[PDB]
């Protein structure tokens with residue numbers, strides 16, 4: 001159906017990536033996976049921002065060309081995205097030929113339109129003896145005419161109040177940068193060579209941010225021979241996920257660029273806060289030890305919308321223990337044991353309102369599914385997952401309330417025992433569906449133990465809509481590890497310090 005395009009920032013390859021950059025790439029992966037499962041036609045881009053002064057310095061310290069240096073880095077990044085199961089449809093690098101060409105043409109085009117002019121870069125109280133300020137950047141530089149599109153950008157902001165999420169960040173951009181008056185922007189540099197040369201004046205390289213921002217267009221084939229993906233996906237729904245500290249580049253410079261090139265503006269910028277480790281933690285270490293799905297769950301659940309989030313060893317191990325192993329794992333494990341013991345693995349047909357608590361569980365499942373969808377559309381994963389774990393929580397309660405082991409010792413309550421059992425399986429099926437974007441492997445294994453096929457859609461989900469003639473596995477396997485909580489905390493702290 002409808003077209004949906006989601007992008008990460010293209011990260012600087014200036015080191016080995018920590019949780020920080022993993023966070024955003026996993027977050028966009030979750031959204032892409034979800035949108036696909038909701039029957040959208042989806043494109044998901046990530047990649048690397050390879051030009052710049054610092055990168056060139058690194059390469060010379062290493063004793064190799066810039067190209068070979070960034071080639072070194074790109075291999076490591078692709079390896080990490082492989083580890084974290086990132087389902088990007090394309091990976092873009094700014095040293096890719098097709099990209100560098102388009103950047104050159106765009107710059108030239110803008111110059112021909114007088115949207116870029118040639119002026120003098122200048123600016124920065126101590127004075128000399130003639131009142132001149134001593135304590136100075138000074139070069140020739142091209143300037144982008146942001147001032148000329150200020151009114152038009154203000155209109156855009158006012159007509160699209162949900163252009164940036166969460167609420168408040170759009171007003172911050174207005175107050176701090178736009179309403180006071182946009183200055184024209186220096187979009188070239190001359191103090192280094194590692195960049196896209198301005199054709200008409202090769203001593204200037206394009207400012208890395210203009211070069212970088214265009215990645216979102218060029219990856220689709222903008223201003224190239226094969227441009228089907230641009231016409232499709234750029235004219236559909238376009239989301240850019242970014243960290244708050246690069247919001248001005250994406251909310252001011254990028255929209256105005258797109259105005260000058262006469263193409264559609266994106267529909268949403270999702271700006272998020274910082275992940276802080278409490279002091280560096282590498283994805284591989286965590287994935288090797290406890291697996292991928294814990295990491296993805298942890299990162300997505302622990303960065304709240306509108307604020308920063310914090311990692312601790314205690315919280316990481318605690319959530320695996322309580323939220324995954326106990327809340328979800330034991331629920332599955334004991335659901336499967338009881339279906340075996342009482343109905344020889346055959347899950348009874350689903351009949352609504354057999355016990356007193358049935359209608360209550362059903363109303364909670366409907367609420368959890370609706371809340372999940374609301375929060376996923378807003379890209380609020382903590383709240384999305386909270387809704388999932390509300391259903392888990394109420395399903396564990398439902399076991400306590402119906403007391404299957406009491407029902408089983410009375411032959412007149414067989415229909416009730418059966419309804420408990422079908423309601424447990426049905427509940428866990430819904431849960432395995434809701435978590436799939438976050439925890440693909442966990443989802444599959446949960447469903448396998450219930451004798452169900454892996455998820456294929458998230459449309460039209462409900463508790464009652466359960467397949468007939470289902471048989472659970474004869475023997476259950478734990479989906480999560482049983483941790484030595486003190487040892488694992490001490491292990492994580494050891495890896496961080498050492």
Ligand SMILES: CSCC[C@H](N)C(=O)NS(=O)(=O)OC[C@H]1O[C@@H](n2cnc3c(N)ncnc32)[C@H](O)[C@@H]1O
Nearest residue numbers: 009010011012020021024049212213242243274275
């Ligand atoms: C056209 S987009 C150009 C982006 C630019 N190259 C850049 O900026 N690169 S970066 O390597 O600095 O990556 C910054 C982004 O990585 C993510 N990031 C890095 N560290 C963290 C962190 N600790 N918590 C959350 N996100 C983080 C956010 O998405 C930031 O916006």
